[PDB]
Amino acid sequence: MHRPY
Amino acid sequence: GHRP
Amino acid sequence: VNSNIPTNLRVLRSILENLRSKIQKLESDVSAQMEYCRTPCTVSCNIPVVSGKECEEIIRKGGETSEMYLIQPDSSVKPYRVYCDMNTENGGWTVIQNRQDGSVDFGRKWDPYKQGFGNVATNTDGKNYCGLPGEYWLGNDKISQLTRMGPTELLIEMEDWKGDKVKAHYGGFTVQNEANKYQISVNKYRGTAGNALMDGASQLMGENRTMTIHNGMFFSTYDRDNDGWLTSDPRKQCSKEDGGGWWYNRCHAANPNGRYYWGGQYTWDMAKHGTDDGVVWMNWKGSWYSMRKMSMKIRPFFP
Amino acid sequence: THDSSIRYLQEIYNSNNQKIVNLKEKVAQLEAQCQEPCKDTVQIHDITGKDCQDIANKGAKQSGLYFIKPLKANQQFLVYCEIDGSGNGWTVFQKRLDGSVDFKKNWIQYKEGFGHLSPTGTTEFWLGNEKIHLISTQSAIPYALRVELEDWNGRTSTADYAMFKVGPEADKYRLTYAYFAGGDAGDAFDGFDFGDDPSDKFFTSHNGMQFSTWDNDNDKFEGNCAEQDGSGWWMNKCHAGHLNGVYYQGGTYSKASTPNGYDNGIIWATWKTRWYSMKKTTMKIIPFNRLT
Amino acid sequence: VIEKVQHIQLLQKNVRAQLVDMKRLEVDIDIKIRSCRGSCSRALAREVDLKDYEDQQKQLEQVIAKD
Numbered sequence: 265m266h267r268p269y
Numbered sequence: 270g271h272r273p
Numbered sequence: 274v275n276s277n278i279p280t281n282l283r284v285l286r287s288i289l290e291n292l293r294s295k296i297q298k299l300e301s302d303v304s305a306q307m308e309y310c311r312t313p314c315t316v317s318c319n320i321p322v323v324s325g326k327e328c329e330e331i332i333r334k335g336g337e338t339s340e341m342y343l344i345q346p347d348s349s350v351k352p353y354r355v356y357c358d359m360n361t362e363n364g365g366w367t368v369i370q371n372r373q374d375g376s377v378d379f380g381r382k383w384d385p386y387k388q389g390f391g392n393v394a395t396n397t398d399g400k401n402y403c404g405l406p407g408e409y410w411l412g413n414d415k416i417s418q419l420t421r422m423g424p425t426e427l428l429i430e431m432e433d434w435k436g437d438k439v440k441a442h443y444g445g446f447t448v449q450n451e452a453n454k455y456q457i458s459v460n461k462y463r464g465t466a467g468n469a470l471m472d473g474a475s476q477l478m479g480e481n482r483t484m485t486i487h488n489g490m491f492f493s494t495y496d497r498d499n500d501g502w503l504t505s506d507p508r509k510q511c512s513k514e515d516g517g518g519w520w521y522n523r524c525h526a527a528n529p530n531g532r533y534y535w536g537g538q539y540t541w542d543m544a545k546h547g548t549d550d551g552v553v554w555m556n557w558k559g560s561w562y563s564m565r566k567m568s569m570k571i572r573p574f575f576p
Numbered sequence: 577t578h579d580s581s582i583r584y585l586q587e588i589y590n591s592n593n594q595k596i597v598n599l600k601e602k603v604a605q606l607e608a609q610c611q612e613p614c615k616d617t618v619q620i621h622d623i624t625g626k627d628c629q630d631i632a633n634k635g636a637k638q639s640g641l642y643f644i645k646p647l648k649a650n651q652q653f654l655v656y657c658e659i660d661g662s663g664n665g666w667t668v669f670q671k672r673l674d675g676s677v678d679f680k681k682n683w684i685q686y687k688e689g690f691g692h693l694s695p696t697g698t699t700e701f702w703l704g705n706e707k708i709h710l711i712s713t714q715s716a717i718p719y720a721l722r723v724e725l726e727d728w729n730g731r732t733s734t735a736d737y738a739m740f741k742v743g744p745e746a747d748k749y750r751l752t753y754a755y756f757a758g759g760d761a762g763d764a765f766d767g768f769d770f771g772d773d774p775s776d777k778f779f780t781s782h783n784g785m786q787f788s789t790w791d792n793d794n795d796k797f798e799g800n801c802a803e804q805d806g807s808g809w810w811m812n813k814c815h816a817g818h819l820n821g822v823y824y825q826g827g828t829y830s831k832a833s834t835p836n837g838y839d840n841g842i843i844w845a846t847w848k849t850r851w852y853s854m855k856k857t858t859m860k861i862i863p864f865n866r867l868t
Numbered sequence: 869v870i871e872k873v874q875h876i877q878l879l880q881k882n883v884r885a886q887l888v889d890m891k892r893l894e895v896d897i898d899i900k901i902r903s904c905r906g907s908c909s910r911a912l913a914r915e916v917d918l919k920d921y922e923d924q925q926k927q928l929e930q931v932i933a934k935d
């Protein structure tokens with residue numbers, strides 16, 4: 265899972 | 270045991 | 274006219290009363306589990322005569338069966354217990370991390386991940402030796418010191434709640450010491466599960482993909498931030514949200530040490546922090562799917 | 577009107593809502609409870625020495641698993657130590673009690689050792705040949721071997737041997753003892769007169785014999801004793817004492833139950849017929865000066 | 869006069885959050901208890917009924933759409 269900029 |  | 278559907282939206286009573294009942298339940302369960310936990314589980318792992326520096330060596334010394342052995346990687350290291358897989362692809366595998374029944378809490382602090390935790394192994398029915406592995410995490414130091422003895426390869430495996438399995442092989446594996454925050458280094462991939470460690474989640478694109486890359490990352494625990502998620506907010510740290518200790522970037526593509534969701538299929542409204550904190554490997558089953566089996570084994574490569 | 581109701585779902589909402597807070601309290605408290613691993617009943621003592629005697633002389637008082645590092649040995653290794661009140665440290669290298677462990681192994685497996693070690697000593701095993709070699713030859717002082725048997729009637733006997741040494745792998749871990757030192761189990765290593773050929777007794781003696789496994793023949797039989805009798809032992813065409821043989825429940829067995837028609841059980845001819853396999857077996861050594 | 873409207877619609881908009889939260893604590897507890905099996909004498913054999921949680925959310929969400 266990612267965390268958008 | 271013994272093998273003749 | 275007015276007050277059309279008034280007592281209609283009185284269904285809140287039904288809802289609330291129930292929940293009030295659902296709570297009486299949970300409180301019960303925690304009490305019992307609190308009581309059951311008055312006497313600890315126990316095992317009796319008689320130690321196999323043959324020992325070595327690691328599992329590989331042991332199998333070359335006659336260690337034919339897969340079970341707990343005692344290895345002493347180095348003369349300076351106190352010999353320690355570890356589970357050896359001597360069947361999967363040539364054996365000699367030293368299990369580093371393992372998940373299979375959710376019997377062990379994987380969301381622990383920095384010291385427990387450093388020291389290692391869990392159950393190396395348990396007894397197989399009758400037999401006097403511990404032939405079944407337990408859920409555990411060898412220990413960041415032991416792990417590191419191992420991969421650092423010489424060329425080490427890493428075999429990761431996982432199985433879904435459907436019976437199917439896939440693997441991820443890394444001909445090169447390296448975990449640095451604590452001073453270097455156990456910075457993971459992997460290469461030479463091949464397998465059936467996606468290359469989540471070196472490439473990131475295939476679902477993702479752009480910098481989204483690349484920030485879920487684990488290769489080169491530092492090891493983070495919820496009481497120790499080392500993820501590549503640069504933020505001053507104390508709440509926004511990968512480890513804290515996604516589960517437990519792991520080489521988090523921002524955040525992950527694979528999360529072997531996440532929460533053991535049963536049934537595999539889980540959702541955000543189930544997740545403590547709304548994130549995919551399960552035992553995920555996106556590259557194979559998306560992020561809303563927690564594996565049933567997940568393990569990490571290491572072995573000297575060849576050179 | 578109907579507002580007396582809007583209260584209940586608040587009296588209820590706010591209640592089970594607070595209850596949610598007290599649950600996470602107990603939940604967290606439980607979490608702090610299930611952090612430990614399971615306690616492993618097997619533990620290794622902190623004392624170390626050149627052998628169980630050294631360890632005993634160093635103070636150790638109970639039998640169990642200890643680390644010993646003989647002189648010319650480049651790595652400490654675990655062993656089971658037998659310590660009695662009189663302060664004697666028997667370093668045990670062989671053990672049989674139930675057909676649990678499979679003794680039909682190869683050269684490497686016998687050189688390195690197999691089976692498991694238990695603090696309770698209720699476990700079957702074979703410490704490594706090399707390990708045995710190192711221990712018995714580690715220094716000037718001579719060792720003594722005590723073979724201890726038990727039948728299926730609860731009776732037990734022993735056979736002691738002085739100057740017990742085990743040659744290096746270069747010499748196939750040859751078994752050598754200066755002489756039988758008595759014991760009600762008799763001296764099976766002296767060979768045994770079975771009746772046929774007048775060399776019965778000669779060809780069944782063990783002193784001086786080298787070790788043999790199916791994959792490494794060093795017996796005095798043009799054939800492979802280790803392979804037939806399916807074990808690892810100091811063969812000589814073939815044996816009169818075979819403590820590493822097949823385990824036979826109840827002791828009594830026939831030449832029928834045998835794969836090759838040859839007695840391959842755990843025998844000690846000088847104490848019981850070759851068609852009677854011991855119920856329990858023990859092979860332990862201790863410095864010679866410890867018996868007088 | 870409509871003392872009960874903005875209150876009912878908020879009390880509901882508020883219990884609907886209590887659901888979402890319980891579901892998580894339901895799950896959170898289920899998981900917590902099992903991480904115990906490998907640490908205590910034995911773990912409580914339990915079953916999480918979260919199909920009913922969806923059923924109450926849906927029911928409510930339908931209701932939370934009247935006014």
Ligand SMILES: *[C@@H]1O[C@H](CO)[C@@H](O[C@@H]2O[C@H](CO)[C@@H](O)[C@H](O)[C@H]2NC(C)=O)[C@H](O)[C@H]1NC(C)=O
Pocket residue numbers: 268477478479480481
């Ligand atoms: C990476 O992810 C982010 C969000 O997860 C994407 O950025 C956009 O974010 C806004 C608000 O969060 C949305 O309205 C857009 O729909 C998102 N982009 C789209 C259309 O996916 C970002 O685009 C992602 N990078 C890619 C394209 O892979």
Ligand SMILES: [Ca+2]
Pocket residue numbers: 378380381607
């Ligand atoms: Ca925790």
Ligand SMILES: [Ca+2]
Pocket residue numbers: 498499500501502503504509510511
């Ligand atoms: Ca951060």
Ligand SMILES: [Ca+2]
Pocket residue numbers: 769770771772773774775776777
């Ligand atoms: Ca004769």
Ligand SMILES: [Ca+2]
Pocket residue numbers: 793794795796797798799800
């Ligand atoms: Ca021969």
